[PDB]
Amino acid sequence: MVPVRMAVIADPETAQGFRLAGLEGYGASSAEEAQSLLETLVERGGYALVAVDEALLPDPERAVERLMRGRDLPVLLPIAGLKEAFQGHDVEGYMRELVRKTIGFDIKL
Amino acid sequence: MVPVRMAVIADPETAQGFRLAGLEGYGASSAEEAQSLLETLVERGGYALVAVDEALLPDPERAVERLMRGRDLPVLLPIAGLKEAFQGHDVEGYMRELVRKTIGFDIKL
Amino acid sequence: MVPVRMAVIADPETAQGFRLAGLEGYGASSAEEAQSLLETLVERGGYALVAVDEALLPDPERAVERLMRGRDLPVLLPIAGLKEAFQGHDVEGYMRELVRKTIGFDIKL
Amino acid sequence: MVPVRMAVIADPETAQGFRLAGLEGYGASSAEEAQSLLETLVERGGYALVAVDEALLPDPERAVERLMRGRDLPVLLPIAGLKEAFQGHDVEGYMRELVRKTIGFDIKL
Amino acid sequence: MVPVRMAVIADPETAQGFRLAGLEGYGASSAEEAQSLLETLVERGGYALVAVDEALLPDPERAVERLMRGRDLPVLLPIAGLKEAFQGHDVEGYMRELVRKTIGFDIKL
Amino acid sequence: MVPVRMAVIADPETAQGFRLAGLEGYGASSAEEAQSLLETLVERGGYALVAVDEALLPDPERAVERLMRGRDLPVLLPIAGLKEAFQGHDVEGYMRELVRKTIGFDIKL
Ligand SMILES: [Ca+2]
Ligand SMILES: [Ca+2]
Ligand SMILES: [Ca+2]
Ligand SMILES: [Ca+2]
């Protein structure tokens, strides 16, 4: 059974009070500015709950939408006939070309 | 100049061929296996690119939408009086009741 | 005693409840996402039991078998007369050639 | 692009010879010691190819089938109404008891 | 003072049940498979006792006998006059030629 | 194709000279210091080869026999009726009693 871990986002004064009382408080002074803090926490995904002063989280739904979309992803390339990289003998080569011809990259392998 | 790391998702025999060639090949026998491989690769972190047999990724956009999304989220909680939680002299107790009052679920702090 | 580690896979809001309560819940919205979850999980060897919402696991037998079949395997090459590789002065090259005769894939040793 | 690694499973003396020659040889004196080495190599994870002295491999289809079944089972327990672990505030109690009804087993959480 | 580490080897269903109870159960279905399991545990090192279903250990003296003949060893080469290697300036080359003079093998150092 | 690892066990100053020339020298001043070092190298696991000064190796077949046939074993306990440990209600303690029962030793589990 696991530690439940909770973050609190409030105004910087208030967050310092939270800190001094033994809780995990984070200062934010505007909303957008809170939202970025949230991605960072759902990032470092210790937390079961983030309590946010409501003036700093007026649209809970929209904030959710945005964190999810800050995930840096690799490029994904679908390919027809991967099998045919074994037809010859520079497989690495064949993929370097394959990719280069698809996305225009001399992807730096 | 950072290293470009590429992974390859193909049918299991094809994935074996890539690995024998010194490429990072991973085998999957279906769409949903491919997607779970994507999450593992994302979770791990250093891939600029995943190349996927397109019978296993017919829809890079859908797949991307699940990587950004998949996330289990924290209960995100906008709270109307965090500042009042310094009025008493047990902040930890006040906050525990504030969650319980609110979302019904008692939280384990 | 050694702990017993359990995971619970459920509807996304019930999963958050499990987290708040100190258990190790995971949200999933369909049967797919749920086996995609399983996959991701079952390679993280720690869990002894997995409790899954009946709705997201209409067949606990077949879900097993999918997961068994998901393991990436080295190519297994039985060889007669492995020892012959020491008749000459080139075991690496002997082996690379043996692999190629046998499996067609020219391994990069 | 990565190190291409092969292991060789042979009789102890032969395995010593391969290790002298720069290859990763493991010695086995029975089929089961080889099957155990296969599983260990696989669970370690870095091998594209495993060569095995045929005299050590009674049935290579079977040996794969065992590696596929060798992921080593987290008991799986489909459950009707997980939601209602929030009727009363002992989510854990409920779980250990439910599990005990279902699986006929106590569990140590 | 430090708790005695014990493993249990039993048929897979039972082995699963010992795990749910917090104990270290490992599943096997034959005398040979089980001896393999003894050897992996023995090599792996931390156990003071292994309790084995007798159906899986019908000959436990022969079992000991074997555990202690599965250890992979280096080739052990006694040499006269190892010093004399310091008289002519290519110690590594001297040693290469030595080993080859004694066992036939050109070693890759 | 991997680097071949060799060690050299010789008198302390000869071993220092092996190190100054880039080889893996280990000093021993007695037969029993030499046998310790072999055990330590065997136990690390890499070495294709261990060259030992003959003066430190009174009996090489004894040396090998001690390597195989000497490391400290797990007591090995065949048991009748392990299944019967669940059909109590306290497996952990039913097991404490059953091993004491047998060997005589209230072992520290
Ligand atoms: Ca981003
Ligand atoms: Ca989820
Ligand atoms: Ca796979
Ligand atoms: Ca061995």
Instruction: List the CATH number of the domain containing B85.
Output: 6.10.140.810
Measured between alpha carbons, how far is D45 from F41 in angstroms, rounded to an integer? 24
CB neighbours of E5 closer than 8 A, spacing ≥ 6? E24, E46, E47, E48, E49
Residue with tokens 């994302």: B42
Which of E9, E16, E44, E65 is the mutation pick for testing D, counting most D CBs within 10 A? E16
Q: Is A109 inside any structural domain?
A: no
Total domains in chain A come to: 2
Find the helix or strand (DSSP H, E) in which E50 lies: strand E49-53
* Same domain for C86 and C59: no
Q: Is E34 inside any structural domain?
A: yes
Search chain C and give the residue with CA nearest F90. Answer: C1
CB neighbours of A75 closer than 8 A, spacing ≥ 6? A103, B48, B49, B50
Contact between C25 and D96 (Cβ < 8 Å): no
Retrieve residue A87's tokens.
């037809």
Q: Could you say which DSSP state residue A89 is in?
A: S
CA angle F11, F14, F16 (to 5 degrees): 110
Residue with tokens 């498979």: E33
The answer to whether the CB atoms of D16 and E107 lie below 8 A apart is no
* Same domain for A40 and A90: no
Residue with tokens 């505030």: D89
Among the listed residues A26, C14, A8, the one whose alpha carbon sits nearest the alpha carbon of residue B94: A8
Measured between alpha carbons, how far is A74 from B45 in angstroms, rounded to an integer? 9
Range of B83's domain? 72-104
What is the torsional sign of CA B104, B106, C2, C5?
positive
Nearest ligand by distance to the CA of A67? 1
Preceding residues of all breaks in chain D (C to N beyond 2.5 angstroms)? none
Nearest ligand by distance to the CA of A69? 1
Angle at which helices C60-68 and C31-42 cross, to 10°: 50
Q: Is B17 on the interface with A (CB under 8 A)?
A: yes
* Same domain for A61 and A12: yes
Distances (CA, A) of D43 to C45, D24, D60, D83, E51: 11, 16, 18, 36, 24
C43-62: b or e for each residue (b if 16 or more CB lie within 10 Å)?
A: eeeebbbbbbbebbbeeeee
DSSP three-state, residue F28: coil
From the list C16, C23, C105, which residue is nearest A1 (CB)? C23
DSSP three-state, residue B102: helix
Q: Is F109 inside any structural domain?
A: no
Retrieve residue E40's tokens.
């992996």
* Same domain for B84 and B35: no
Retrieve residue E52's tokens.
């084995």
Nearest ligand by distance to the CA of A71? 1
Let me know how long chain E is: 109
Q: Is C109 inside any structural domain?
A: no
Distance from CA of D92 to the nearest CA of E (A): 15
Search chain A and give the residue with CA nearest D108. Answer: A1
* Same domain for E82 and E63: no
| Method of determination used here | X-ray
Chain B neighbors of C37, CB-CB under 8 A: 36
Q: Is E57 inside any structural domain?
A: yes
Contact between D67 and C71 (Cβ < 8 Å): yes
DSSP A26-47: EE-SSHHHHHHHHHHHHHS---
Find the helix or strand (DSSP H, E) in which D42 lies: helix D31-44
Distance from CA of A109 to the nearest CA of B (A): 5
Among the listed residues D74, B43, B32, B66, the one whose alpha carbon sits nearest the alpha carbon of residue C36: B32
Distance from CA of B64 to the nearest CA of A (A): 8
Measured between alpha carbons, how far is F39 from B35 in angstroms, rounded to an integer? 47
Q: Is A75 on the interface with D (CB under 8 A)?
A: no
CB atoms within 10 A of CB D69: 15
Among the listed residues F51, B32, B24, C96, the one whose alpha carbon sits nearest the alpha carbon of residue E77: F51
CA E107 to chain centre: 24
Among the listed residues F105, F107, F7, the one whose alpha carbon sits nearest the alpha carbon of residue F52: F7
Q: Is F81 on the interface with D (CB under 8 A)?
A: no
Measured between alpha carbons, how far is A14 from A26 in angstroms, rounded to an integer? 9
Q: Kindly report each contact of residues B83-91 with a partner whose C-beta sits within 8 Å and lies 24 or more positions away, as own/partner.
A: B83/A10, B83/A14, B83/A53, B86/A14, B86/A17, B86/A21, B91/A17, B91/A18, B91/A21, B91/A22, B91/A23
From the list D36, D105, D106, which residue is nearest E36 (CB)? D36
Measured between alpha carbons, how far is D107 from D105 in angstroms, rounded to an integer? 6
Rg of chain E (C-alpha set): 23
B8-44: b or e for each residue (b if 16 or more CB lie within 10 Å)?
A: bbbbbebbbbbbbbbbbbbbbebbbbbbbbbbebbee
Judging by beta carbons within 10 Å of its beta carbon (0-12, 13-18, 19+), is residue E29 exposed, middle or buried? exposed
Contact between B63 and A45 (Cβ < 8 Å): no
CA C74 to chain centre: 13
DSSP three-state, residue B70: coil
Alpha helices in chain A (DSSP H): 12-20, 31-43, 60-68, 91-103
Contact between B36 and B63 (Cβ < 8 Å): no
CB atoms within 10 A of CB C29: 12
Residue with tokens 């080897």: E9
Contact between E24 and E18 (Cβ < 8 Å): yes
HEC string of chain C? CCCCCEEEEECHHHHHHHHHCCCCEEECCCHHHHHHHHHHHHCCCCCCEEEEEHHHCCCHHHHHHHHHCCCCCCEEEEECCHHHHHCCCCHHHHHHHHHHHHHCCCCCC
Retrieve residue D59's tokens.
């049935």
Measured between alpha carbons, how far is F14 from B64 in angstroms, rounded to an integer? 63
CA angle F29, F30, F36 (to 5 degrees): 100
Q: Is A38 inside any structural domain?
A: yes
Structure resolution, Å: 2.2
* Same domain for D79 and D66: no
Retrieve residue A13's tokens.
């004064």
Search chain C and give the residue with CA nearest D62. Answer: C76
Residues A44/A47/A49/A52 CA torsion (nearest 10 deg) = -40
Retrieve residue F45's tokens.
């696991």
Measured between alpha carbons, how far is A60 from B43 in angstroms, rounded to an integer? 25
Residue with tokens 């004491």: F100
* Same domain for E53 and E20: yes
DSSP three-state, residue B7: strand
- Side chain identity at residue C53, one-letter code: D
Q: Is B109 inside any structural domain?
A: no
Contact between E73 and E50 (Cβ < 8 Å): no
Distances (CA, A) of C100 to D82, E57, F24: 54, 42, 36
Q: Is D4 on the interface with B (CB under 8 A)?
A: yes
Chain D neighbors of A1, CB-CB under 8 A: 92, 109
Q: Is A52 inside any structural domain?
A: yes
Measured between alpha carbons, how far is A7 from A15 in angstroms, rounded to an integer? 10
* Same domain for D78 and D63: no
Chain C neighbors of E20, CB-CB under 8 A: 4, 48-49
* Same domain for E85 and E67: no
* Same domain for B82 and B37: no
CB atoms within 10 A of CB D39: 17
Which of C4, C5, C19 is the mutation pick for testing A, counting most A CBs within 10 A? C19
Measured between alpha carbons, how far is D76 from C59 in angstroms, rounded to an integer? 10
Retrieve residue F62's tokens.
């004894």
Measured between alpha carbons, how far is F60 from E78 in angstroms, rounded to an integer? 8
CB atoms within 10 A of CB A50: 25
State in Å: Cα D27 to ligand 4 middle: 4
Q: Could you say which DSSP state residue F26 is in?
A: E
Distances (CA, A) of A64 to A8, B73, B99, E23, E35: 16, 8, 19, 42, 54
Among the listed residues D66, D49, D22, A34, the one whose alpha carbon sits nearest the alpha carbon of residue C77: D49
* CATH classification at residue C24: 3.40.50.10580
Among the listed residues D50, D6, B25, the one whose alpha carbon sits nearest the alpha carbon of residue A83: B25
**Strand residues in chain D grouped as ranges (E):** 6-10, 24-27, 49-53, 75-79
From the list A1, A92, A109, which residue is nearest D109 (CB)? A1
What is the torsional sign of CA B57, B59, B61, B62?
negative
Retrieve residue A49's tokens.
């709950």
* Same domain for A87 and A65: no
Q: Could you say which DSSP state residue F73 is in?
A: P
Measured between alpha carbons, how far is B16 from B27 in angstroms, rounded to an integer? 7
Q: Which of A 18-37 lie inside 8 A of B, CB atoms?
A: 18, 21-23
Find the helix or strand (DSSP H, E) in which F12 lies: helix F12-20
Retrieve residue D58's tokens.
């009674």
* Same domain for E99 and E82: yes
